[PDB]
């Protein structure tokens, strides 16, 4: 068959929303507190994550049907998925070549080691790379990548969500466009969809793991003081 | 609270 | 007459405490979010102030008799005087030559203009320079400058102080050493003391003015998000 | 609260 207008205008909006919020030159990174190779990377990475949340929020605001949700459900969805969306978009800067996130010269190239000097260990930093590699290999079209993010964000299974029925409906509509698009426009993608939805499950573990690690970090004031107000708010437990 | 998020969300 | 042992060992400790917490090369400034000339300097100056609070705390911890105060009075004294102490120590980087704070090349030289792009206006930025100039002119010895700071910090007239009698006693002892020192070691300083105590009154206005300006800034989340956890805590109203 | 100050004050 072939895509419908309503469906296609979802893709235009999402692709445009991503372009308006993701810079392939990573030029704004010079405004972050400089990276330093207890937890010397914490200051810089905290700024990177903070910056990203802001970007994920601008993108979310442009997902069709999201601005119609209650301020509360919008907050609940962002708080629970923020980290997952940061991880998804980060794939664009990930390099299978050097297994790192290359956002600039040697200064902004992020190795597994670096994330360690920011409060995280190898044991759990391992799944992040595996996720990045598996995701990178799927060679997603910009349209599929931007859709997966919109779908992740609209997961109705999030702590704190109220109108889980409406969220469920929206996520469903987006899942259609993603399925249709693969079928129509993606040659050789018979299993792709299932593989993508699979990636959403991997993001949950990565999410949970991060929560535990972050919790520890935040309870130690000498460390939480290195974070930013937005990060402390988005990953905080206040309800 | 969520003062900052309410603001960024317009 | 001449100084006593107890008195002199107060001077050794204070001078050493300042040396251990003030770097004349301002080398750590490269770790702050870079300066940018709504409120583009806010990010960098917020880091400068944050850094300073940390330094003022390390100094305070070394003021004789301070660590014996209750954790509460220590917090109350720091919260109310922090800004004044930041202003006093800043005199060391102030230049009557160019009316600015020269902490590095053109990048870390702070003009009145810059503080404006950080949420503050000229109307009240004016008294800060006048204070800096008047203070600079007094050509204080390192011993007198470090004493004035210790005295400012131990003002018993601070909102939230409990044991105001003990604070009052400590500040009094320091006032002795300052008075004695001027007399014994400071040739030509008959009015100096009175001039110094005068400066403490100017710091109160500067303090009050800052409070009002800061209050406005902090109530606007798009701005407070640019501040640091420590700054938000020290200048915050939580009791 | 004053979590950070309590910490910095040892
Ligand atoms: C971003 C970029 C990269 C992402 C990275 C590399 C550094 C560390 C990050 C940010 C991972 C961190 C979160 C660290 C933050 C904090 C606050 C200190 O807990 C990982 C947590 C995941 C595991 C499972 C390792 O615990 C998640 C995604 C990783 C660059 C660019 O693509 C924009 C994007 O927008
Ligand atoms: C420090 C230095 C300079 C001090 C400065 C220049 C930039 C702006 C400052 C920091 C003044 C600011 C406070 C701005 C902070 C904030 C959080 C944005 O409300 C002024 C407020 C005073 C008036 C009266 C103008 O409102 C106070 C002292 C000034 C450098 C070095 O000497 C270390 C020292 O340790």
CA dihedral sign, ordered A56, A58, A64, A67: positive
Ligand 1 pocket mutation, candidates A54, A101, A215, criterion most atoms within 8 A of CB: A101
DSSP, residue by residue, A200-221: HHHHHHHHHHHHHHHHHHHHSH
Ligand 1 pocket mutation, candidates A45, A89, A214, criterion most atoms within 8 A of CB: A45
CA C216, CA B7: separation in Å to the nearest integer?
16
The vertex-C62 CA angle with C58 and C63, nearest 5°, equals: 120
Whose CA is closest to C90, among C105, C107, C102?
C102
Q: How was this structure determined?
A: X-ray
Instruction: State the smallest CA–CA distance between residue A235 and chain B in angstroms.
Output: 11
CA A67, CA A55: separation in Å to the nearest integer?
16
- What residues of A are in contact with residue B3 (Cβ under 8 Å)? 233
Query: CB neighbours of C73 closer than 8 A, spacing ≥ 6?
Result: C161, C162, C163, C167
CA A10, CA A144: separation in Å to the nearest integer?
12
Q: Is C177 left (phi over 0), alpha (psi -120 to 50) or beta?
A: alpha
> How far from C145 is each of A175, C58, C96, C127, C228, CA to CA, in Å?
68, 17, 17, 20, 28
DSSP, residue by residue, chain A: ----HHHHHHHHHHHHHHHTT--TT-GGGGGSPPP----TTHHHHHHHHHHHHHHHHHHHTTSTTTTTS-HHHHHHHHHHHHHHHHHHHHGGGEETTTTEEE-SSGGGEE-HHHHHTTT--HHHHHHHHHHHHHHHHT---HHHHHHHHHHHHT-S--TT-S-HHHHHHHHHHHHHHHHHHHHHH-TT-SSHHHHHHHHHHHHHHHHHHHHHHHHHHHHSHHHHTTS-HHHHHHSS---
Check CB contact under 8 Å for B9 and A75.
yes
Length of chain B as a residue count? 10
Cβ atoms within 10 Å of A236's Cβ, excluding its own? 16
CB < 8 Å from A in window 1-10 of B? 1-6, 8-10
Q: Supply the residue whose CA is at minimum distance from atom 8 of ligand 1.
A: A115
Partnered with residue C102 across adjacent β-strands are C109
Q: Please tell me which chains touch D, using 3 or more CB pairs under 8 Å as the contact test.
A: A, C
Whose CA is closest to A149, among A84, A221, A206?
A84
Q: Which domains does chain C have, with CATH numbers?
A: 1-239 (1.10.565.10)
Of A31, A34, A229, the CB nearest to C232: A229
Burial of A237 from C-beta contacts in 10 A (0-12 / 13-18 / 19+): exposed
Partnered with residue C110 across adjacent β-strands are C101
Cβ atoms within 10 Å of A145's Cβ, excluding its own? 21
Instruction: State the smallest CA–CA distance between residue A225 and chain C in angstroms.
Output: 5
CA A102, CA A105: separation in Å to the nearest integer?
8
Please give the number of the atom of ligand 2 that sits closest to the Cα of C90.
32
Q: Which-ligand-closest: CA of A54?
A: 1
CA D3, CA D10: separation in Å to the nearest integer?
11
Partnered with residue C109 across adjacent β-strands are C102
- What residues of A are in contact with residue C229 (Cβ under 8 Å)? 224-225, 227, 229, 232
**Any CB–CB contact under 8 A between A221 and chain D?**
yes
Check CB contact under 8 Å for D1 and C78.
no
Distance of CA C195 to the CA centre of its chain: 17
Give the CA radius of gyration of chain C.
18
C109 membership: H or E segment, kind and range: strand C109-110
> How far from A209 is each of A80, A201, A229, C123, CA to CA, in Å?
13, 13, 22, 51
Check CB contact under 8 Å for C227 and A227.
no
Query: CB neighbours of C69 closer than 8 A, spacing ≥ 6?
Result: C77, C163, C166, C167
Instruction: State the smallest CA–CA distance between residue D1 and chain A in angstroms.
Output: 11
Partnered with residue A109 across adjacent β-strands are A102
Can you give the resolution of this entry in Å?
Answer: 2.7
- What residues of D are in contact with residue A222 (Cβ under 8 Å)? 4, 7-8
Length of chain D as a residue count? 10
């Amino acid at each position: 068959h072939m895509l419908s207008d309503e469906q296609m205008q979802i893709i235009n909006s999402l692709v445009e929303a991503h372009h308006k919020t993701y810079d392939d030159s990573y030029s704004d990174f010079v405004r972050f507190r400089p990276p330093v190779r207890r937890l010397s990377m914490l200051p810089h990475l905290a700024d990177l994550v903070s910056y990203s949340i802001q970007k994920v929020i601008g993108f979310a605001k442009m997902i069709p049907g999201f601005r119609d949700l209650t301020a509360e459900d919008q907050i609940a969805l962002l708080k629970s998925s923020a980290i997952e969306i940061i991880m998804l978009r980060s794939n664009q800067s990930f390099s299978l070549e050097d297994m790192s996130w290359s956002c600039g010269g040697p200064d902004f190239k992020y190795c597994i080691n670096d994330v360690t000097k920011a409060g995280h260990t190898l044991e759990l930093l391992e799944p992040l790379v595996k996720f990045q590699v598996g995701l990178k290999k799927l060679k997603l079209h910009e349209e599929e990548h931007v859709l997966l993010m919109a779908i992740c964000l609209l997961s109705p299974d999030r702590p704190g969500v109220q109108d889980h029925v409406r969220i469920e409906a929206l996520q469903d509509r987006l899942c259609d466009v993603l399925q249709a698009y693969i079928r129509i426009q993606h040659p050789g993608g018979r299993l792709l969809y299932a593989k993508m939805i699979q990636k959403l499950a991997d993001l949950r573990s990565l999410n949970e793991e991060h929560s535990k690690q972050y919790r520890s970090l935040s309870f130690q004031p000498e460390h939480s003081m290195q974070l930013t107000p937005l990060v402390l708010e988005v990953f905080g437990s206040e309800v | 609270k969520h003062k900052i998020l309410h603001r960024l969300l317009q």
